């Protein structure tokens with residue numbers, strides 16, 4: 398029964414998930430002036446040519462586009478990472494209004510939404526084991542601003558009306574996640590956590606500096622989803638973001654400038 402409301406939202410999560418007040422919680426504000434340029438960071442390697450999407454699911458918090466991660470297909474490596482991480486799913490966080498929705502912020506700026514491409518470290522064999530490790534996951538975070546449409550998003554937007562409510566899913570094959578990436582792979586990176594319960598401190602965050610553009614009509618369609626299940630009172634799925642958490646004893650590193 399965690400969620401995003403007054404009575405079960407982010408300020409409550411610590412009662413069931415006490416690491417909410419831990420030492421490497423996400424998201425955070427990225428202060429671009431105090432991010433350190435790290436000339437030892439490598440270009441990010443994103444190899445999505447063989448990605449195999451399976452399904453899209455409304456899980457009552459967001460929607461997940463899920464991939465077959467049983468072979469070495471869609472992998473993230475390089476950047477700040479030490480080995481190979483396999484794509485398992487992406488999802489977004491977004492707001493009720495274009496002025497909020499991202500979880501990370503950039504000099505306190507909130508974007509309209511934020512995409513998370515979740516990958517697990519192949520040295521741990523699967524996602525469930527990888528989340529128990531401090532280097533288990535790598536999440537590629539991409540900001541969304543409202544402007545032009547993102548054509549490579551439209552296939553996702555079009556299916557949403559089939560998964561309006563919690564627990565619905567739809568076949569979702571042949572979706573190419575390369576169509577959601579901006580031109581540049583310049584990034585910031587820091588050690589953090591899941592931004593949703595159970596808030597495990599297992600993620601290397603890689604947040605792209607360049608946002609993607611989506612249209613107002615595309616994000617409106619995200620806002621028509623529902624947190625409730627079918628046959629329950631309608632609670633629009635909006636504002637499903639955790640606010641920025643204290644940076645504590647961490648440094649955010651930049652791959653550029």
Ligand SMILES: NS(=O)(=O)c1cc(C(=O)CSc2nc3cc(Br)ccc3[nH]2)ccc1Cl
Nearest residue numbers: 458513515528534536590591592593594595
């Ligand atoms: N928001 S996020 O930090 O990118 C993130 C979100 C998710 C979600 O699917 C959000 S809802 C959710 N995440 C879970 C993870 C575990 Br373990 C167990 C139950 C969960 N339910 C899974 C992984 C990551 Cl890394």
Ligand SMILES: [Zn+2]
Nearest residue numbers: 489490513592
């Ligand atoms: Zn997320």
